[PDB]
Design a protein around this nucleic acid. Sequence first.
RNA 1: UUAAGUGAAUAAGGGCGCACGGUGGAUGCCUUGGCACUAGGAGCCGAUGAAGGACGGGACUAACACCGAUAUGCUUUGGGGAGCUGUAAGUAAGCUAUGAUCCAGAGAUUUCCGAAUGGGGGAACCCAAUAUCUUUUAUAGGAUAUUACUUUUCAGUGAAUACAUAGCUGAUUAGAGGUAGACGCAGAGAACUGAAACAUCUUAGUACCUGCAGGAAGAGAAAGAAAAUUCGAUUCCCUGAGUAGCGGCGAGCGAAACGGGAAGAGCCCAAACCAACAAGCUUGUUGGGGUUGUAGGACUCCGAUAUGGUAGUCUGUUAGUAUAGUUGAAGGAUUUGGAAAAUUCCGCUAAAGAGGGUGAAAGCCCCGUAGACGAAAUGCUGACAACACCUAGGAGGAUCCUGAGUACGGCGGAACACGAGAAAUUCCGUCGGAAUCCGCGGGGACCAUCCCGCAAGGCUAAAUACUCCCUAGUGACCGAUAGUGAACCAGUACCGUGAGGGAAAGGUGAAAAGCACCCCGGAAGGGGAGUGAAAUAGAUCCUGAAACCGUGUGCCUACAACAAGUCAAAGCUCGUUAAUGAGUGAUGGCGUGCCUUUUGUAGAAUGAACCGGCGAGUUACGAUUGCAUGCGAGGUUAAGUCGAAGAGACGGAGCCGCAGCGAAAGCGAGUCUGAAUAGGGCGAAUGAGUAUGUAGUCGUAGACCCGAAACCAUGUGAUCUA
RNA 2: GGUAGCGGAGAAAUUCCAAACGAACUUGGAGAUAGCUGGUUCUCUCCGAAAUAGCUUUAGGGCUAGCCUCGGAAUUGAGAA
RNA 3: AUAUCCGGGAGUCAGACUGCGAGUGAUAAGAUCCGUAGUCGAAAGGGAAACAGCCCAGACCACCAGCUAAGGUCCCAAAAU
RNA 4: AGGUGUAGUGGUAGGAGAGCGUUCUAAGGGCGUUGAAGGUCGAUCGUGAGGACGGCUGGAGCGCUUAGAAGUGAGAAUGCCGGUAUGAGUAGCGAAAGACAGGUGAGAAUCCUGUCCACCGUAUGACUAAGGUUUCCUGGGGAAGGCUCGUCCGCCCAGGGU
RNA 5: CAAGCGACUGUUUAUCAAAAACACAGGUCUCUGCAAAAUCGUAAGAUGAAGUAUAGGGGCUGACGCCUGCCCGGUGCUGGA
RNA 6: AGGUAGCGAAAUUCCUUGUCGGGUAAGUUCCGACCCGCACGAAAGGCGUAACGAUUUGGGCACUGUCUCAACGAGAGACUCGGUGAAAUUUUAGUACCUGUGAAGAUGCAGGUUACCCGCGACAGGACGGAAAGACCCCAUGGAGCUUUACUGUAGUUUGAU
RNA 7: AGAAGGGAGCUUGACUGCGAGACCUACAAGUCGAGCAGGGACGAAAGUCGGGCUUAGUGAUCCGGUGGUUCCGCAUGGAA
Lengths: 118, 154, 97
Amino acid sequence: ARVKGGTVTRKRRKKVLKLAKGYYGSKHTLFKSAKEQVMNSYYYAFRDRRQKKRDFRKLWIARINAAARMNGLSYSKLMHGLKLAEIDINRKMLADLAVNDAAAFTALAEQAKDALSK
Amino acid sequence: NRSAVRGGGRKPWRQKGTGRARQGSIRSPQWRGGGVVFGPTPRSYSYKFPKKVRRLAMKSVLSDKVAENNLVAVEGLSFDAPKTKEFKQVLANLSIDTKVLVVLENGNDFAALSARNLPNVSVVTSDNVSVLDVVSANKVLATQTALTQIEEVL
Amino acid sequence: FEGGQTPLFRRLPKRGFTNINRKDYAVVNLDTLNRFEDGTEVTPVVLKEAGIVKNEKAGIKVLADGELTKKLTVKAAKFSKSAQEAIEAAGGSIEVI
RNA sequence: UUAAGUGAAUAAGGGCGCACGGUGGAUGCCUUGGCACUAGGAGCCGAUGAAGGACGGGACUAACACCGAUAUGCUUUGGGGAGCUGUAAGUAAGCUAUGAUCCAGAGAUUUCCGAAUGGGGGAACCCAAUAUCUUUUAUAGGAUAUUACUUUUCAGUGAAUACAUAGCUGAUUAGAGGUAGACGCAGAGAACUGAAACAUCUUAGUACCUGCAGGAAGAGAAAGAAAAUUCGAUUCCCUGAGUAGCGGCGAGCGAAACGGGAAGAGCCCAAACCAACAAGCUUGUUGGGGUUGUAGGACUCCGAUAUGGUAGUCUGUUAGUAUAGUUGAAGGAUUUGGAAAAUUCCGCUAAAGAGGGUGAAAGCCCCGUAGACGAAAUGCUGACAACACCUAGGAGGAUCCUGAGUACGGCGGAACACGAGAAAUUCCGUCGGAAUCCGCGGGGACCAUCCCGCAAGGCUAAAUACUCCCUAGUGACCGAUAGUGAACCAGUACCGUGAGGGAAAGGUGAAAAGCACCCCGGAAGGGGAGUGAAAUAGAUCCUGAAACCGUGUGCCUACAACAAGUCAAAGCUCGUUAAUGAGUGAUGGCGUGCCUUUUGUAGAAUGAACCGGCGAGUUACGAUUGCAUGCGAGGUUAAGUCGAAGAGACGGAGCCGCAGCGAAAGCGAGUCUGAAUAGGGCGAAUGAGUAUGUAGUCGUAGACCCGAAACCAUGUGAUCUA
RNA sequence: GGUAGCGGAGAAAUUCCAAACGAACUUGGAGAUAGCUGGUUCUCUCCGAAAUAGCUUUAGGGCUAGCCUCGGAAUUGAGAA
RNA sequence: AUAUCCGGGAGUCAGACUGCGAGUGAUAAGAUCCGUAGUCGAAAGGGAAACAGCCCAGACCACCAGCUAAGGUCCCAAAAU
RNA sequence: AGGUGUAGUGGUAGGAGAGCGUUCUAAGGGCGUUGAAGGUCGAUCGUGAGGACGGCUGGAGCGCUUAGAAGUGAGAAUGCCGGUAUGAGUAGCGAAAGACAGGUGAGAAUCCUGUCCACCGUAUGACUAAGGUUUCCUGGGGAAGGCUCGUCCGCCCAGGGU
RNA sequence: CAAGCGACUGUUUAUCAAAAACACAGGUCUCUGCAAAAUCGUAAGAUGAAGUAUAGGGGCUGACGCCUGCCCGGUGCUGGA
RNA sequence: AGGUAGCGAAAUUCCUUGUCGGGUAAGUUCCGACCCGCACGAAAGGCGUAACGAUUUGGGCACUGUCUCAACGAGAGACUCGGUGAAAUUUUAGUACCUGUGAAGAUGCAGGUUACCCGCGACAGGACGGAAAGACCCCAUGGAGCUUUACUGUAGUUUGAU
RNA sequence: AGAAGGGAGCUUGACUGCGAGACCUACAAGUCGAGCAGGGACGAAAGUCGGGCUUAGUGAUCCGGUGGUUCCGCAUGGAA
Ligand SMILES: [K+]
Ligand SMILES: [K+]
Ligand SMILES: [K+]
Ligand SMILES: [K+]
Ligand SMILES: [K+]
Ligand SMILES: [K+]
Ligand SMILES: [K+]
Ligand SMILES: [K+]
Ligand SMILES: [K+]
Ligand SMILES: [K+]
Ligand SMILES: [K+]
Ligand SMILES: [K+]
Ligand SMILES: [K+]
Ligand SMILES: [K+]
Ligand SMILES: [K+]
Ligand SMILES: [K+]
Ligand SMILES: [K+]
Ligand SMILES: [K+]
Ligand SMILES: [K+]
Ligand SMILES: [K+]
Ligand SMILES: [K+]
Ligand SMILES: [K+]
Ligand SMILES: [K+]
Ligand SMILES: [K+]
Ligand SMILES: [K+]
Ligand SMILES: [K+]
Ligand SMILES: [K+]
Ligand SMILES: [K+]
Ligand SMILES: [K+]
Ligand SMILES: [K+]
Ligand SMILES: [K+]
Ligand SMILES: [K+]
Ligand SMILES: [K+]
Ligand SMILES: [K+]
Ligand SMILES: [K+]
Ligand SMILES: [K+]
Ligand SMILES: [K+]
Ligand SMILES: [K+]
Ligand SMILES: [K+]
Ligand SMILES: [K+]
Ligand SMILES: [K+]
Ligand SMILES: [K+]
Ligand SMILES: [K+]
Ligand SMILES: [K+]
Ligand SMILES: [K+]
Ligand SMILES: [K+]
Ligand SMILES: [K+]
Ligand SMILES: [K+]
Ligand SMILES: [K+]
Ligand SMILES: [K+]
Ligand SMILES: [K+]
Ligand SMILES: [K+]
Ligand SMILES: [K+]
Ligand SMILES: [K+]
Ligand SMILES: [K+]
Ligand SMILES: [K+]
Ligand SMILES: [Mg+2]
Ligand SMILES: [Mg+2]
Ligand SMILES: [Mg+2]
Ligand SMILES: [Mg+2]
Ligand SMILES: [Mg+2]
Ligand SMILES: [Mg+2]
Ligand SMILES: [Mg+2]
Ligand SMILES: [Mg+2]
Ligand SMILES: [Mg+2]
Ligand SMILES: [Mg+2]
Ligand SMILES: [Mg+2]
Ligand SMILES: [Mg+2]
Ligand SMILES: [Mg+2]
Ligand SMILES: [Mg+2]
Ligand SMILES: [Mg+2]
Ligand SMILES: [Mg+2]
Ligand SMILES: [Mg+2]
Ligand SMILES: [Mg+2]
Ligand SMILES: [Mg+2]
Ligand SMILES: [Mg+2]
Ligand SMILES: [Mg+2]
Ligand SMILES: [Mg+2]
Ligand SMILES: [Mg+2]
Ligand SMILES: [Mg+2]
Ligand SMILES: [Mg+2]
Ligand SMILES: [Mg+2]
Ligand SMILES: [Mg+2]
Ligand SMILES: [Mg+2]
Ligand SMILES: [Mg+2]
Ligand SMILES: [Mg+2]
Ligand SMILES: [Mg+2]
Ligand SMILES: [Mg+2]
Ligand SMILES: [Mg+2]
Ligand SMILES: [Mg+2]
Ligand SMILES: [Mg+2]
Ligand SMILES: [Mg+2]
Ligand SMILES: [Mg+2]
Ligand SMILES: [Mg+2]
Ligand SMILES: [Mg+2]
Ligand SMILES: [Mg+2]
Ligand SMILES: [Mg+2]
Ligand SMILES: [Mg+2]
Ligand SMILES: [Mg+2]
Ligand SMILES: [Mg+2]
Ligand SMILES: [Mg+2]
Ligand SMILES: [Mg+2]
Ligand SMILES: [Mg+2]
Ligand SMILES: [Mg+2]
Ligand SMILES: [Mg+2]
Ligand SMILES: [Mg+2]
Ligand SMILES: [Mg+2]
Ligand SMILES: [Mg+2]
Ligand SMILES: [Mg+2]
Ligand SMILES: [Mg+2]
Ligand SMILES: [Mg+2]
Ligand SMILES: [Mg+2]
Ligand SMILES: [Mg+2]
Ligand SMILES: [Mg+2]
Ligand SMILES: [Mg+2]
Ligand SMILES: [Mg+2]
Ligand SMILES: [Mg+2]
Ligand SMILES: [Mg+2]
Ligand SMILES: [Mg+2]
Ligand SMILES: [Mg+2]
Ligand SMILES: [Mg+2]
Ligand SMILES: [Mg+2]
Ligand SMILES: [Mg+2]
Ligand SMILES: [Mg+2]
Ligand SMILES: [Mg+2]
Ligand SMILES: [Mg+2]
């Protein structure tokens, strides 16, 4: 028999337009522009789920570096000293101690400095 | 198709220079009102299985009805005059309330007449019985002479 | 088509001819004649009814492929020399029709 | 106080989200109409004026439909039984139980143009002759009839020119055009195309043009097919077979007979000879006679005036049938609702549970359906009768007959599947040119032998092809961008000098109940009030998408360079399919669209303004492989017949497989090569096929879709311009 | 009023023949042909090339081979390092 | 842990750069033509500021976890002023 | 039925496999005026095509399961048709003189009347052939047409006129 | 005032060329005895002409003035045979 | 058979702006002359020529906004307001500069620099701006028109046989 | 140069049927070949010889010519 276009076409395009809500001007309005930008958004979103892991480790290291220097030590020497002392605390936890519990961070720094001397 | 659609002989406009897409006919398929590309064309859908396969199929459905005890054989179905209510009562007599294929011997006009109007009944003669006839029915009601004729046919 | 390289068939010569009077015989081998009982008269009609030879072509020719084990009086258009010996060695007999 | 520092809020406009509107007409549902077919009907109409038109006819009439100055109808025969005066309302005026409207059969009327046909003409107009009638005192005016051309036959007149003949006048007779854009036969006859170019060839003897048709046509009753020994007109279907062959032996082209089916049917002339008549012993007319190949007939003998047959006729009679019709079972409540057929409850009818309609979905409300029944009239068919028309057996061969400028041959073309080829068979043009029963033709050059037939005369039903129309239906066909170009006043509007091209455009509601009245406004249009179940159903009227346009505002925005997102993120505003929620987003990191085409494109290559709809590997027949099922050394039927446009049954002709090898004779589990028991090639040893389904791919077809410049063949144009 | 497309007409320009004339317009053959350009619409999973040789009136086309994929058979395991 | 072999289905026959070995060229060319390896093609990620073909390395996915490669560690900008 | 272990899971041309969704058919089983399809919204589910569930709109039909058949999936073809944007409130409004008074009217630079002014005058006058074919006259009208306006018109309506 | 080109008036590429291009009067060659040659047409029938060599067709040249040389081997034409 | 008369750097002369003379302050053009005529030449005529030409060419007089070198004035458009209201184009655009990079010429990539938001009148450097599927160039075993001692045919013409 | 170069005698193996197995190769082709049989040349014999030191000296099919032939011969014998 004859199968006319029906409603499938509209349904499919409406899904893309919903993904494009909040985009500027025609990019949330017109299907072709919206689909092109949703594709680019997907490309960015996948790439950025990898990049966010890089960015946060970059943030923690910088914060640990600032706290390390306040304890008479560079970031690189502190991580060497913690490794020598068998401390497995990760950079997310160290950065959190650097900001929220400075006394605990100082206790870790002292253990690292002790391990470096030995 | 584009040849069958009315008109469309001439080239709509010159090949080059108008800035328009080149077109060869107003009845080209991408045109509104143009010829259909491919699409239905009259044809038959019938094919014939090997005879041995036809015979096996017919025996299978008949043996399936018996195996499920859906084959109700009656000595005979007699009616002085065709009356639906009476055949309807016979179906009640035999406790048949589901779709039934009533298989009658040749010449039993009045049994066929009285059975056929019931919405759950399908009537065939013993010499015109098909696989689709049997499979459709939940039950087969066959007179004794109809069964004998079937066994002579098969 | 080979894109313009002389096609294989043009490279090769035509050979032979077809004989207007050519006669092709329907072949029956001895193993097929073991299907008949001892003393049977095997005939082109009998073979047709048996469904062994539906088309006898120019005639039935009997060939000695297998081993014959029953005694028969075989009738056919032609007999291979070996088939004749086998049929008669089995104590049967052949007849050219 | 002073100094230094930090520092919100604000928006002219804009962004995002959300809400509500407008525009528009997608989507859904629906359908007036289409598409493809099946069964039957009918396959022609015209000088007795056709097809197709023009102009007219109504109480008002622009259009359509109907009708034709007897005009929106007349008579008549049937049917039908209460309303009717079409679409189309409205008023108006009428008709109808003394039977209207309406329906069917048969008649009457049927202006003008158009073959048109008294003459003319730029179709639907103009202008005559002759006769009769009529108007007027009369002329003028009006009415009816007849008057084209050619053909056939007859008569009469009648030239050069004697008789004649031709011509001429009249009568008689018959054609003249149109279609159904189909089917048939015949004349004439392309090109693009394929051959990967191209002249043979192919496309094709196709398209186109022209003639002639007929409901079918054509073919047809053996100078046949054959060589199993036989068959016994033709046509068509299956098969033979993509075989034999043809072929720049390329591309391609491609049989036939046998076998199986559908359907079947045979007959008349010419000649000899006889008789009659007429004419110049023959030489015509008529009638008889006669009709062919195991030769027939004439003829001469005898012997029967029977028996059978028919593809005869407005010959009646009869039956059936088509074209109007009649009859035709069975439901009430309850719940919901504007409405019930939905629902629940109990019932009933069914030879009817096909289908449609009805305020939603109805076997039981309506129209119907199954079934029964019906014909004044006119067709059509079948019988029966009548009438007409055909239909003799056997024996004899002395003689006579049995199709001539024919057969055939040379030359040139063509048709045969067969392209001149070794080319038979058939035909056309040209020239030559037989025999005739002790004869003649064919059996694929040709000859002999044998076999089969008997040309140069004609006719013939059925099986086959097609469908503009008519009737009843059908569809895993369309559902308004589809389906016919056209569901709607479409071949219209519109474009064009013309041939010719050619659209768009369906939906209020169950019912108009189509919004009285009021209010603003000149109106348009609104607001109320009403109608309605609903009017955000108000006629641009069902649903009412998107682009696009606007209004409100939760958050953000006036130091910022941004394919505009993404990841991180305060603040603010909100509260969900309750989910480790939603909107917005300062600020920070990262980041050059989509597609096509390319070595490589963000690309300063291509394509898209946007949104919506439509828009591209399909089908048929064949080849082949995988998968699957049935059967298996077997597998399987085709056409066709019966049957629901079904399954199925029958049908074994045929096809594949079971044996190969060889160019072939031929041999055969081998065979070919060869001197060879050799070696080697291909086979067997060392078996699986076949039917159907399904999918992949291929081939022939437009073959996935769109696109040339061009080529060819009919037509239309010199109202521009030379 | 006459001449019409295989044509006409041309104090001649390939000039005119109904607003494009080295050959009008229209309809048909006809869906001409197009080894060329463009386009070819849902998803996920497994595997995954080539841009080379030979021949070609062949060079931006094609054919066989090479390289990919799917299925199958089988051997004293024939592959790779 | 592939190889052949049999069969169904293809696509490909414009390649590019880089290193190395040659020719052509002026031992010019992002030149041209072979050989050889790689990458691109058909490969995202990190480095080379940006930068198909270079260096490191092959993305089934989730993580605000860890270790490294090339390359880096004064600020932009992660890490030794 | 699942479990463990090891390994593997970039990809164009292209091959293979397995699915999603669309319309229709058959059978079965169902849902619908207590509201079908369709539309719209939502913070919902699945590995993907995609699937539910609610609110609103809507007013009649439509799912589901298994199998079948397909005019079965669009974003690109300077694709076809329709609608609507952008450029924009932008170009343009087609060779020239008008002014004022009075009137008409809901409304007048634009209609009527008056006055003066200006323009053509081998004409921009008067006839007539062709061509057009009702455009002529009278009375009304202001939707559209008129490149603005309009009370006016070669337009529309109703009558008439050779 | 002067030079080129064309004698002159004319004609032409409607819509990019008006000219030195075409035409022209004049020149020359050649065909044609009339059912002429030439042309349209299958043909019939036409034009040429209701003309007749002082006419008609065709080629070239291009008012006028002065002039127009050499080559007949080749190719055509004509005659021979 | 070897070009005669006449003409000649020519509408013909490549070298070439030949050389000489004239005209100019200065002359690749123009005129006169010369003759090595690349490659004039006698009816596809040679040479000359009064008259003629919207013909080509050089000089002169007059004349001037052509120019030195631009100024002012009139009108129409542009501009502002009222009415009316298109178009080509357009992947979405919050649309800077430099140097660099890259399919080797970037508003958009890198680095740096500059830049508050929105317009209006102006100008055209860029958007390899718009318009037209380059016409040049090459290619396609494309097309068409034209030519001939290309091939194969053929109308016509002619000759013979019949 | 244990010749493949050079001379001489006799010769025709510059044989017929073939050919395990290899090389080359997309195909079509191309290349090498021991060995077997027939009948030989030279040589006393062993043995060598299916051209030449090796590698170029060539052209598919269609269509024709010529020679041979226990093949076919469109009813049959012939013929074509
Ligand atoms: K604001
Ligand atoms: K007429
Ligand atoms: K028809
Ligand atoms: K051709
Ligand atoms: K071709
Ligand atoms: K007939
Ligand atoms: K065939
Ligand atoms: K060929
Ligand atoms: K008779
Ligand atoms: K009903
Ligand atoms: K009757
Ligand atoms: K022949
Ligand atoms: K014969
Ligand atoms: K015969
Ligand atoms: K509504
Ligand atoms: K908003
Ligand atoms: K950002
Ligand atoms: K370009
Ligand atoms: K062998
Ligand atoms: K042998
Ligand atoms: K099987
Ligand atoms: K198959
Ligand atoms: K196709
Ligand atoms: K195909
Ligand atoms: K004219
Ligand atoms: K002219
Ligand atoms: K393969
Ligand atoms: K390299
Ligand atoms: K790789
Ligand atoms: K909903
Ligand atoms: K399709
Ligand atoms: K598009
Ligand atoms: K617009
Ligand atoms: K705008
Ligand atoms: K008025
Ligand atoms: K001139
Ligand atoms: K002149
Ligand atoms: K002169
Ligand atoms: K002029
Ligand atoms: K001219
Ligand atoms: K002269
Ligand atoms: K002359
Ligand atoms: K001349
Ligand atoms: K002259
Ligand atoms: K000469
Ligand atoms: K001569
Ligand atoms: K000179
Ligand atoms: K010269
Ligand atoms: K000087
Ligand atoms: K002059
Ligand atoms: K002039
Ligand atoms: K001035
Ligand atoms: K580029
Ligand atoms: K600019
Ligand atoms: K052309
Ligand atoms: K020697
Ligand atoms: Mg669609
Ligand atoms: Mg067409
Ligand atoms: Mg455009
Ligand atoms: Mg259509
Ligand atoms: Mg008839
Ligand atoms: Mg009556
Ligand atoms: Mg008349
Ligand atoms: Mg071709
Ligand atoms: Mg009833
Ligand atoms: Mg009920
Ligand atoms: Mg032929
Ligand atoms: Mg003959
Ligand atoms: Mg002849
Ligand atoms: Mg006989
Ligand atoms: Mg017939
Ligand atoms: Mg339509
Ligand atoms: Mg619709
Ligand atoms: Mg239409
Ligand atoms: Mg509503
Ligand atoms: Mg609506
Ligand atoms: Mg600043
Ligand atoms: Mg700020
Ligand atoms: Mg390139
Ligand atoms: Mg782009
Ligand atoms: Mg750009
Ligand atoms: Mg574009
Ligand atoms: Mg005409
Ligand atoms: Mg005329
Ligand atoms: Mg020219
Ligand atoms: Mg013109
Ligand atoms: Mg064709
Ligand atoms: Mg892989
Ligand atoms: Mg070749
Ligand atoms: Mg290079
Ligand atoms: Mg590529
Ligand atoms: Mg990369
Ligand atoms: Mg790339
Ligand atoms: Mg740092
Ligand atoms: Mg340091
Ligand atoms: Mg991976
Ligand atoms: Mg639906
Ligand atoms: Mg489709
Ligand atoms: Mg679109
Ligand atoms: Mg502007
Ligand atoms: Mg004006
Ligand atoms: Mg004046
Ligand atoms: Mg004047
Ligand atoms: Mg008037
Ligand atoms: Mg008036
Ligand atoms: Mg107006
Ligand atoms: Mg002149
Ligand atoms: Mg002049
Ligand atoms: Mg011009
Ligand atoms: Mg001009
Ligand atoms: Mg001249
Ligand atoms: Mg000079
Ligand atoms: Mg000067
Ligand atoms: Mg000088
Ligand atoms: Mg000259
Ligand atoms: Mg001369
Ligand atoms: Mg001259
Ligand atoms: Mg304005
Ligand atoms: Mg660069
Ligand atoms: Mg740059
Ligand atoms: Mg950016
Ligand atoms: Mg970057
Ligand atoms: Mg441009
Ligand atoms: Mg191009
Ligand atoms: Mg013979
Ligand atoms: Mg014969």
